[PDB]
Structures are given as structure tokens and as C-alpha cells.
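Order emerges. For instance:

***
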Amino acid sequence: APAFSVSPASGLSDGQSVSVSVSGAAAGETYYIAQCAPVGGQDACNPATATSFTTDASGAASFSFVVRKSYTGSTPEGTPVGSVDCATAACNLGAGNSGLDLGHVALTF
């Protein structure tokens, strides 16, 4: 029901900044966002860009995000699992919180 966009999402370069837009989410709440690749059942996300944002009264938010073609990645609890290469691993930018998962948008470099 909420909307979640990430653009551009293809033809990407390491360190490129993309735009993130959320709408129709829970009003006035905190959500989390990160670039991750699925490995072994858990998501290995970039800990240097993993972050949070708040929504306005309409459940919307927008901000910029830096994507990495490859990076040293960690699981949700902070455990390092080594490095991920998005030229081969299926990386996506995903957002959400305990009450609602806003979705996944696949990234291509």
C-alpha cells in the first residue's frame, strides 16, 4: 500500500548517489534503509550507509543514498561477513521497520 522508489536503479557506478522516495507509509514514524545482498539466509548490508529516516504527516519521506558496487558487509546484528560484489551478488536497496516492510528495489551496476 505504501509506495517506495529508488532511482536510478541500473547503469550504476560505485559511489553513485541515487534518490529514495517513500509515500503512504505510517505517518510520523521512523523507518530504516540499507543496501544489502542476500547471503546464507541473512542480508549482508553496507554498514557505512545503513541508516534511518522519519516520515511526515502523509507518511512520506525523500532523501539521497550512496550505492556501492562492492563493499565490506555486515548482518543486521553488526557481524561482518566479509565482502559482497554487486556485479554478481543480487543487491537491492530495501526499507522498512517492525510494522511494515516498504519493499526491495534491485540494483544493477
Observations:
- The chain has no helices and ten strands.
- Strands lie at 3-7, 17-23, 30-39, 42-45, 51-54, 61-66, 70-74, 80-85, 92-97, 100-106.
- The first strand starts at residue 3 and ends at 7.
- The chain has one domain: 1-109.
